[PDB]
Ligand binder design. Structure first.
Ligand code: IMB
Ligand code: IMB
Lengths: 398, 398
């Protein structure tokens, strides 16, 4: 049985992760759960998985949770605050750490797990976007095994040779017969929309994800392909890949999750249903496999699979992300920050769908900052990009 | 780097193999080339790769080769006969033996390489189709390493976890998280043809292989799907798969070469150009990669990829193969034998296209002998199934 702490257990990934342990109680044991303010869900989780510790990121939620657990008879030790989260992510006992706390708050805890040499199930994919360097450096200096939970990166992981799977992040791609990494995306809902109409697209239209359903912010990112841009940035750090070793390909059906091209012409791909339990279960069980609860993909009920090259005039955000990577970590975290503001602004109906890319570009032009040397520096860049982003939204909205 | 013997060097696979060698001088050294009667090519190959030995089918063909090699200044030593052919596959200083001699011949030579514990580049279907059990028991005894060269089997191997690859046939699919092997095939030229018309199809119509060109006998095998049936038989032996661990899908475009599904929902696949140098280069460099000279496939220049389940009314040969497996090596050897006679008879316009499956089934029901104990036994079953089959064809010509 492997012991693990789930960073961000009340969220979607967290629940999908707990579902997987539910399918394999003999294989996994939850030692600790860490969450934010969703006390009700945290209570059910503690009552069902009996963790040694339950941590909230707030004293008000911790006491509120502590009262309910005691009322229910649970003796799970309650804690509060980011420091506690970091302690859970470094417990001598635990083997794996499901890093699913999104945003800045996930940085330090995830870093703690890495330093503690734990096996990290990286769901907090945005932490490579901002601390790619720091994180990969720390990963190598501790030999902590990184296992990407993101569907695209996981697909690539599974399609990569074993020597790279181990030593992930500092292994030599070319030396292992790998030509390039093929990152796939659906192209969003506006794949075939006339460029002329992109400026008038509405939040509800942009939120109609082509295949499966998901959050509004991440849906918009899928429509601008910024998600693919952020994933591009992450992949470069994660698989130690150069610009010429990366390819982006639109694949509307999203049956293939991503691929890897090899020296001899071979292309290895991972395919499957749109259910996060699959990549999650893959990482939790690696190098082996376990039942995930996901139905077997039925090839006889699929839409014909197609592919196409990404048109940059249609996806300026995708080009913007690629260009930013070559500029530095300051640029990528700034791009991420800005996109956070502009998308929320678009959803709030303050700016046009097309204003997302332009404003995003605009913020990077104004930044002009030095590459961070630590997390605290990253937070600094992030914060400055958000205010600049907010000024432009207000400047454009007024 | 690697010393190798090439069984059937003058054929298609053999040449593709030398091209990979020509592409990687520093990695492979040709120790021995074995062929039939094509002295012309054996000369150029011997001149270009300076093997130590070369053997031809008969003394005449060899006598002539020896003269030209001497006259051309070549130092290679000439031999002839099956025993010399087998001796080359067992040379102490040989690492890999590309087993590309097809049919009843090449059986003993590939068994020779297995018995010598070498790494076998299996590009000979006859082996597993007629001696599946004898051979897998043999490779298990000598610890020989089988690397499948055939496109479908190679794709499956590439999509299988490392523990299975290093222990082919001997490994356990379920313990390693594999739920099943997905064998793909184009479905042939008659994939869409009305069932009633199959009886009138001509050799020429049967020989229009859907995606790329190939032999007439093989094109026909693709039209009847006997092609996939034989591969189905091999796959079960090669990867130790049960009936329920096998799936046969029709994939018209042949971009996906085959796949394997895992317990967590993941499906790994191998894609590429229809060039044999890819799978050959793969087995030669395994566990690493080498240049094959094959153009990387362009995902933007493909036709929509589709799938469909094979209808046994349309492809009775497929089902026949599946049934023969349950009956043992005598049944599979008999099916293979009968099929060579009926296909050839079809090509000669002696029987109808639909007479192929009909007569294959029929000779199978007339066959007695069951479960051979050695190669000579299968050879005997082969010889008898051919005679029964020839009479079938001759009786039908009345
Ligand atoms: O895991 P990712 O990469 O964040 C996500 N990709 C996803 N790919 C396949 C299936 C999914 C099912 C549910 C949620 C996300 C999914 P996206 O690229 O943001 O759409
Ligand atoms: O290697 P296999 O698997 O025997 C063969 N598949 C093949 N796939 C791609 C290209 C080929 C070029 C020449 C001959 C056979 C080829 P088939 O399935 O018998 O058609």
């Amino acid at each position: 049985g492997k012991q693990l702490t789930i960073l961000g257990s009340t969220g979607s990934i967290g629940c999908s992760t707990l579902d997987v342990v539910r399918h394999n109680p003999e294989h996994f044991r939850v030692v600790a759960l860490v969450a934010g303010k969703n006390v009700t869900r945290m209570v059910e989780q503690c009552l069902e998985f009996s963790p040694r510790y339950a941590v909230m990121d707030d004293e008000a939620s911790a006491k509120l949770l502590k009262t309910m657990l005691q009322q229910q008879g649970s003796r799970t030790e309650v804690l509060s605050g980011q420091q506690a989260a970091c302690d859970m992510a470094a417990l001598e006992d635990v083997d794996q750490v499901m890093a699913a706390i999104v945003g800045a708050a996930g940085l330090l805890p995830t870093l703690a797990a890495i330093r503690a040499g734990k096996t990290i199930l990286l769901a907090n994919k945005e932490s490579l976007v901002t601390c790619g360097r720091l994180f990969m450096d720390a990963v190598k200096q501790s030999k902590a095994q990184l296992l990407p939970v993101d569907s695209e990166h996981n697909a690539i992981f599974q399609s990569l040779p074993q020597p790279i799977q181990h030593n992930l992040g500092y292994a030599d791609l070319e030396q292992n017969g790998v030509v390039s990494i093929l990152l796939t995306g659906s192209g969003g809902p506006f794949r075939e929309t006339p460029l002329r109409d992109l400026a008038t697209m509405t939040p509800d239209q942009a939120c109609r994800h082509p295949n499966w359903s998901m959050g509004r912010k991440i849906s918009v990112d899928s429509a601008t392909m910024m998600n693919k841009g952020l994933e591009y940035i992450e992949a470069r750090w994660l698989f130690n890949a150069s610009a010429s070793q990366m390819e982006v390909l639109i694949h509307p059906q999203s049956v293939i999750h991503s691929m890897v091209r090899y020296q001899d012409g071979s292309v290895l791909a991972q395919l499957g249903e749109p259910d996060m339990r699959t990549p999650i279960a893959h990482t939790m069980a690696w190098p082996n496999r376990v039942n995930s609860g996901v139905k077997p993909l039925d090839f006889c009920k699929l839409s014909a699979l197609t592919f196409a090259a990404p048109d940059y005039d249609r996806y300026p955000c995708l080009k913007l992300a690629m260009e930013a990577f070559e500029q530095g970590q300051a640029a990528t975290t700034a791009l991420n920050a800005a996109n956070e503001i502009t998308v929320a602004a678009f959803l709030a109906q303050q700016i046009r769908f097309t204003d997302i890319a332009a404003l995003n570009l605009s913020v990077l032009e104004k930044m002009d900052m030095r590459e961070p040397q630590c997390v605290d520096d990253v937070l600094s860049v992030d914060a400055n990009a958000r205010e600049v982003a907010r000024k432009e939204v207000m400047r454009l909205a007024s």
